[PDB]
Design a protein around this ligand. Structure first.
Ligand SMILES: C[C@H](CO)C(=O)OP(=O)(O)OC[C@H]1O[C@@H](n2cnc3c(N)ncnc32)[C@H](O)[C@@H]1O
Ligand SMILES: C[C@H](CO)C(=O)OP(=O)(O)OC[C@H]1O[C@@H](n2cnc3c(N)ncnc32)[C@H](O)[C@@H]1O
Lengths: 474, 474
């Protein structure tokens, strides 16, 4: 194959740095013919399934129930058809029956290096060897974004149970960058961060796309210009935004830098297994030799053709602790397999990930993802940076209820200017979605901003009714 | 000497674990005759000063101004008398004139691994080799506290600029413990943590003594018992408390576990260079072969005899990046050199560190440290867990003004029970300090608790005057 450090269990050279003039961390693995890589992925898939059969009673039980044993894996077609998908709910029941890490932990208790989790929540018991496999995978993908040794990398997401921050830090450390783990979550942190960014001038920033927006507003309140933070790029995970039309454009303009999308799931660390590159900068590439991504039809858990939408199903190829085999994300995306500008021979998610299928709501037979609303509003000059979607899942909705902020300049322009914006926002959303949208304007900067994941949907029946009645009155 | 891995620059075996039956991580370095260790410390002090002279223009300039060159270091007496102390203000001016890390960074920019700091603030540019020297030093000292490989260690302090959390995590990682970096700082974190502690049952907890108190109150609100978190110990740094009479007793009782004191300064990472051990569990030992501690008279920066009070002055023996040579802490302590129950041949701070000399205030010619008030109040059954000291530095104070919380049970007992507590608190503080104390009772749980460092002194002239006038009225 010629694939660099290709073995299971994996064991990377910690002293390797690619040549300064190379675009790729691993030229072979990253640019080899996709058919040659798929044969090796298949080979690895067999090694992993044999490993899980031996060390995980969770997989042994689940696979026996679905009529599967690792020997029946003779092709990628066998994998999608015979191997049952793992659900997040299955991980919970396993952890409840086999505490604290479940019957899929595999490694002995003595090998566990870090404890993290979700916030029923699940605990991540990550082995020392996997932490190294995560750090190496992430340094490689960060190198792909043009991040280099000696670059100051600001990691600005909460350092707690959440894998995002730890994952970007482990990659910064392995890349021999100057890791700056400022973190997030505490009051007063954002006002302090903009001063640190102004002084330190980092080459790269990590966090959520929502935090990058809130931070530019904080920089402005603090009379600092975020274009003067010396940023070459910002790379995000945790929610949609980095591949959202007007959202990506707003962040790139605010910072005078490039935005990269990355991130699958915390259970799927190394989660940068889906990530854009410096040249293939729109959307994300599926780094197949790190984690095997399948975009599947939710009705049968089989791959959809390229050019079609489905749900990502993920498999670890380089993990011995809590390995995930066909973990169902429950998210929606579109994948293609056209030539990539960076020359990496990987499938692509050209529009990133639209959102979680469960987050979608229906209004008059029309299916709507919150990211579609965020996209339409961010492409408007008068939009103030925040909104809330007010829905009900208890009864059918005839119209979409939006609470939207106008900009401070639209507000300063007076009552007619505010009304013009409100009617224009209503029309634009109606044109994009093909559904009636009622817009209530709220005062600039009244809606809560976040340094984590934005929760713009208010699914409360009482709140929905109160707003519809209030909008019907005015 | 026989001192384990004794070289400069230091380079520890990452695979070494002491035998399961050993009390000491490094038996020689930890238990050798103090006179034999002091000759080696002197030798190392020369290596460090030669290193700083060569690589730091900050030290070259400072030492030339004080009439010192490394060749004049012929004894420990020469070190205290000839070497000028470094002040935190000197570090600031150096960072302003030579941004971002100052003219004491020493290592090339390319060697910087992590960026942290204070919150003018100073930036810490820590090299890869020093991060390893910190992790090894901390695993060694944590082993001394009885913490072992495979033990679940909850690191519950903010992961941001602050060195405390990162330092305890690096030690947990190197000790091959199950590092659980939950962190702190965000709203809702404490309510979630008590559930994680109840489920996971960790062997050890790290944070501030103030956070441990607040967390037991949160565990109780959440109808959980903190004695059932399976804790064998809690180890703290960042402020006094872990060697404070009634404070140490309250935490040990609340959790049914042992409390260990550790911590010098963030500039002095590995900051566990002052730490108690499982057997010498009261106060802290000065781990002299990691960092050279001198308890000095502030009037001349020369060592005080054992049995006397002074200010800790610290020197790195195993750091190449931002090495601190005779950094003045500005804190107050007492040191002794009697036999230790663990058998470690190190000097001791039997009462830990009293506080920062600048935090001290005077009332009618009597010098008072806030930790003395905290000690007197915590030794009272009716005390509710929080208080504020209200002072003025602009004018002379005749009496001490205290805002004290009674317990919920003292409050439920009625007006006479509240009055009895208020007068008893006033008397007790008067007896301990030998000064008049005015006590104003505030409602239970009204005073802000913290997951960081407690700021109990309100030094505002308007607030002081408003309280004295209000107390004079009632
Ligand atoms: C640690 C990991 C990466 O931060 C993480 O966020 O895991 P978590 O369990 O907290 O959330 C995973 C979900 O978050 C969403 N997400 C995550 N990154 C994206 C994205 N780049 N585009 C769009 N949606 C995304 C998506 O719905 C994922 O299934
Ligand atoms: C990272 C490091 C250790 O957490 C730290 O706290 O550094 P920082 O600059 O934030 O504060 C240092 C000061 O905090 C105090 N402190 C610190 N640990 C103690 C203690 N165990 N007993 C009493 N007072 C202490 C003392 O005044 C120190 O000079």
């Amino acid at each position: 194959s010629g694939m660099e450090e290709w073995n299971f269990p994996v064991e990377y050279d910690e002293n390797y740095l690619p040549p300064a003039d190379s675009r790729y961390w691993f030229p072979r693995r990253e640019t080899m013919p996709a058919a040659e890589r798929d044969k090796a992925i298949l080979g690895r898939l067999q090694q992993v399934c044999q490993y899980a059969w031996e060390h995980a009673p969770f997989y042994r039980r689940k696979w026996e129930e679905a009529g599967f044993q690792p020997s029946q894996l003779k092709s990628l077609e066998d994998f999608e058809a015979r191997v049952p998908v793992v659900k997040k709910t299955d991980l919970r029941e396993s952890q409840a029956a086999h505490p604290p890490f479940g019957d899929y932990v595999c490694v002995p208790n003595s090998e566990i290096f870090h404890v993290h989790g979700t916030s029923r929540p699940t605990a991540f018991g990550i082995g020392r060897a996997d932490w190294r496999a995560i750090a190496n995978a992430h340094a490689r993908i960060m190198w792909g974004m043009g991040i280099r040794p000696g670059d100051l990398v600001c990691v600005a997401a909460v350092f707690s149970l959440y894998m995002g921050s730890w994952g970007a830090l482990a990659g910064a450390e392995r890349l021999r960058a100057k890791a700056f783990p400022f973190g997030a979550g505490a009051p007063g942190m954002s006002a302090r961060l903009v001063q640190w960014l102004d002084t330190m001038k980092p080459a790269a920033f990590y966090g959520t796309p929502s935090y990058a927006i809130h931070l530019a507003e904080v920089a402005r309140e603090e009379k600092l210009n975020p274009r003067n933070f010396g940023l070459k790029c910002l790379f995000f995970s945790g929610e949609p935004g980095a591949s959202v039309p007007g959202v990506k454009d707003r962040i790139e303009e605010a910072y005078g830098a490039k935005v990269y999308d990355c991130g699958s799931m915390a259970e799927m660390s190394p989660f940068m297994n889906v990530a854009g590159t410096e040249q293939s900068n729109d959307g994300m590439l599926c780094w197949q030799d790190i984690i095997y991504t399948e975009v599947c039809d939710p009705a049968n858990m089989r791959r959809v053709p390229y050019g079609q939408r489905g749900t990502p199903v993920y498999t670890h190829l380089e993990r011995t602790s809590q390995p995930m085999i066909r973990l169902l994300s429950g998210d929606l995306t579109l994948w293609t397999n056209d030539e990539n500008p960076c020359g990496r021979t990987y499938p692509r998610l050209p529009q990133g990930i639209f959102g979680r299928i469960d987050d979608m709501f229906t209004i008059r037979g029309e299916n709507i993802y919150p990211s579609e609303i965020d996209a339409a509003l961010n492409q408007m000059s008068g939009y103030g940076g925040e909104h809330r979607i007010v829905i009900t899942r208890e009864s059918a909705m005839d119209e979409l209820l939006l609470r939207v902020e106008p900009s401070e300049s639209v507000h300063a322009a007076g009552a007619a200017a505010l009304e013009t914006f409100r009617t224009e926002a209503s029309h634009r959303v109606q044109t994009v979605l093909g559904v009636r949208a009622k817009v209530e304007l709220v005062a600039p900067n009244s809606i809560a901003r976040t340094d984590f994941k934005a929760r713009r949907v208010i699914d409360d029946r009482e709140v929905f009714r109160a707003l519809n009645q209030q909008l019907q009155s005015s």
